[PDB]
């Protein structure tokens, strides 16, 4: 192949304000559509059955480049692809003169390459602060997955066999992609991405849309029915529990999804535990089920974010449990503020509360009910001791 001469220079982006915390800071390489660095050796010159494997070698090289979102010689970006646009669509156009079997296989691989690009862009985007640490931990999980499963598989199997294994092929490439299940794990992460994206789109377009139990108690409270632009906390744990309810029967998929749900929600379980045992509200990303005002000092009015709730709050027992959690937290903060202490001693009651180590396990049965009941009894014991002896 001949060599064309284009000025190619790597450099950090000058304007880094519209770039997320983990967005790519280096500029983009020269695109084949505008700045080709090779006089493309047209394919039909090696289309004969004796040059078929040479064509396969070229195409598999281009596919190993595509599987990480780089354009090969014969598999180039869509005409509408704009790399300087973080919202740009992502498609690949395949050399028309390619062997049709290679073309089919290359389409099926281009699919996973586009999924890789989209997921990379998605973890970059959700690494920001406005998305809540549930979605941030999810983005971290996506990045960890790519780097330590998908990139590992690519590098150590497909590229390594291209370099090392004779009689390697493109059908063996797709087979190896399907073996390690990395395509199914990518399909699960990309389905979760698509669901979060569809919900964001609904919340951004369906904007024109907008109990006596809240008064039956002695409460300076209010429901916060603000439908936030991006789902947070419970709104995304509902997405994950729904994707577990949908993928039942495929047990590897369910194990993967449950590992995801248990990793992502660790910090959320920490929030809920600290709330139900200390009345602490360490919510910097505004995603807990309840919050206060004045961010005179004790004059606090609690709100309930109906958007980030773990449950529906429609039924009777659901509102009972919700208000019991809010009440546990209120009583424990009142105790802490009374004793001027920063935390509540662990021995200030005979009822000990264990942490939350498996979120799905907490949400699945009535474990949330009994857990909040234990926390509520402990809070009421401490609170009535305070108010009856001090």
């Amino acid at each position: 192949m001949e060599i064309k001469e284009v000025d190619d220079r790597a450099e950090l982006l000058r304007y880094t304000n519209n770039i997320p915390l983990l967005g790519k800071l280096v500029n983009h390489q020269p695109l084949w559509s505008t700045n080709p660095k090779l006089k493309s050796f047209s394919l039909e010159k090696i289309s004969a059955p004796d040059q078929r494997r040479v064509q396969e070698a070229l195409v598999v090289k281009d596919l190993l480049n595509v599987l990480i979102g780089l354009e090969g010689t014969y598999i180039r970006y869509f005409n509408d692809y704009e790399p300087s646009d973080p919202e740009t669509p992502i498609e690949f156009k395949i050399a028309k003169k390619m062997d049709p079997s290679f073309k089919t296989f290359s389409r099926r691989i281009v699919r996973y390459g586009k999924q890789y690009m989209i997921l990379t862009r998605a973890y970059e985007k959700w690494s920001d602060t406005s998305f809540g640490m549930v979605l941030q931990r999810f983005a971290y999980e996506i990045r960890r997955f790519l780097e330590d499963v998908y990139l590992k598989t690519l590098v150590e199997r497909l590229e390594r066999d291209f370099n090392k294994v004779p009689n390697f092929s493109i059908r063996e490439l797709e087979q190896i992609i399907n073996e390690t299940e990395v395509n199914k794990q990518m399909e699960l992460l990309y389905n979760i991405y698509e669901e979060i994206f569809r919900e964001i789109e609904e919340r951004r377009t369906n904007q024109s849309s907008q109990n006596e139990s809240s008064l039956h108690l002695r409460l300076m409270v209010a429901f916060d029915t603000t439908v936030y632009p991006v789902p947070k906390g419970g709104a995304i744990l509902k997405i994950f529990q729904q994707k577990i309810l949908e993928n039942l029967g495929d047990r590897s998929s369910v194990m993967f999804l449950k590992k995801l749900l248990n990793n992502i929600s660790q910090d959320y379980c920490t929030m809920l535990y600290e709330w139900l045992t200390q009345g602490i509200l360490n919510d910097p990303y505004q995603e807990f089920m309840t919050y206060d005002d004045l961010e005179r000092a004790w004059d606090t009015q609690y709100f309930i974010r109906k958007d980030v709730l773990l449950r529906d709050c429609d039924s009777e027992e659901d509102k009972n449990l919700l208000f019991k959690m809010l009440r546990t937290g209120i009583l424990l903060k009142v105790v802490r503020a009374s004793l001027q202490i920063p935390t509540i001693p662990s021995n200030s009651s005979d009822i000990t509360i264990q942490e939350i180590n498996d979120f799905a396990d907490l949400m699945e049965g009535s474990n949330l009910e009994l857990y909040v009941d234990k926390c509520y009894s402990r809070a009421n014991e401490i609170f009535l001791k305070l108010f009856f002896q001090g």
């Binding site: 064309k4 790519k24 800071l25 660095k37 396969e56 070698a57 070229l58 590229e159």
Partner: protein, 261 residues
């Protein structure tokens, strides 16, 4: 048919730079140095024309680490000659220590010989590219924000969901808070406001308007309630201010030198 697909693809890419030479020179380019192959410019790396668009894209992804290392080294060398508060110096030291760990990691990769392709080199430095990205974002406004503002921001980022951002923020916060504890220790045991650069909630205020020019009635020290960090209760902040004020009082006006010492 013992010919691998790489050997079948090679004859069409012979007018390009072989991968092994690209690796030899990337060894240096990752450390923000120039070379005969990648003539690292002012702040550009000038990828040659014998490197096609796919290798060029992969080299952009890889050289993100080299350019980030260069920018962070520039920050370190700039602030190493300036007059900055101790907490900014601790932040600069954490930056330079990250750069030193990155250099050690890149040198281990290159010297081990286990890196045989650009894609494996990209996967190996991926998380290091991410850490350098975080470090270069956290310190974009280094010369424009005070140490306590950095404490507030890193306290916001200690709750991030990503474990890497959270860990970097936690370490930066722990170093800057060690030096803030040194500020507090100085003020509480000596009444000193030495080299705080306006990062402390207690500032020496010798600004008078003719009333008490010689500080007979004043003890020229003010206590800004708007600068008390969110991790210190205003009651304990007033107690700190009063402990320092009482130490300075006892030592300077009550001439109680032995007991104050």
């Amino acid at each position: 048919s013992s010919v691998t697909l790489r050997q079948l693809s090679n004859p069409y890419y012979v007018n390009t730079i072989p991968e092994e030479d690209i690796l030899k020179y990337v060894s240096y380019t990752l450390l923000a140095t120039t070379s005969a192959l990648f003539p690292f410019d002012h702040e550009q790396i000038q990828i040659p024309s014998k490197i096609p668009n796919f290798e060029s894209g992969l080299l952009h992804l890889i050289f993100e680490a080299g350019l980030l290392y260069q920018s962070l080294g520039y920050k370190v060398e700039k602030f190493r000659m300036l007059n900055i508060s101790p907490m900014k110096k601790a932040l600069i030291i954490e930056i330079s220590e990250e750069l030193q760990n990155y250099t050690a990691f890149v040198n281990n990769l290159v010297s081990s010989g286990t890196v045989v392709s650009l894609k494996s080199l990209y996967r190996e430095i991926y998380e290091n590219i991410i850490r350098l990205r975080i470090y270069c974002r956290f310190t974009e406004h280094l010369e424009e924000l005070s140490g306590d503002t950095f404490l507030i921001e890193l306290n916001i980022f200690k709750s991030h969901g990503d474990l890497t951002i959270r860990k970097i923020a936690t370490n930066l916060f722990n170093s800057m808070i060690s030096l803030y504890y040194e500020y507090l220790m100085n003020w509480l045991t000596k009444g000193l406001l030495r080299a705080t650069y306006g990062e402390f909630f207690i500032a020496e205020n010798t600004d008078t308007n003719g009333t008490d020019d010689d500080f007979i009635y004043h003890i020229p020290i003010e206590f800004n309630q708007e600068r008390v960090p969110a991790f210190i209760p205003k009651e304990l902040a007033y107690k700190i201010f009063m402990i320092g004020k009482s130490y300075i009082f006892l030592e300077k006006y009550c001439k109680e030198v032995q007991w104050t010492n």
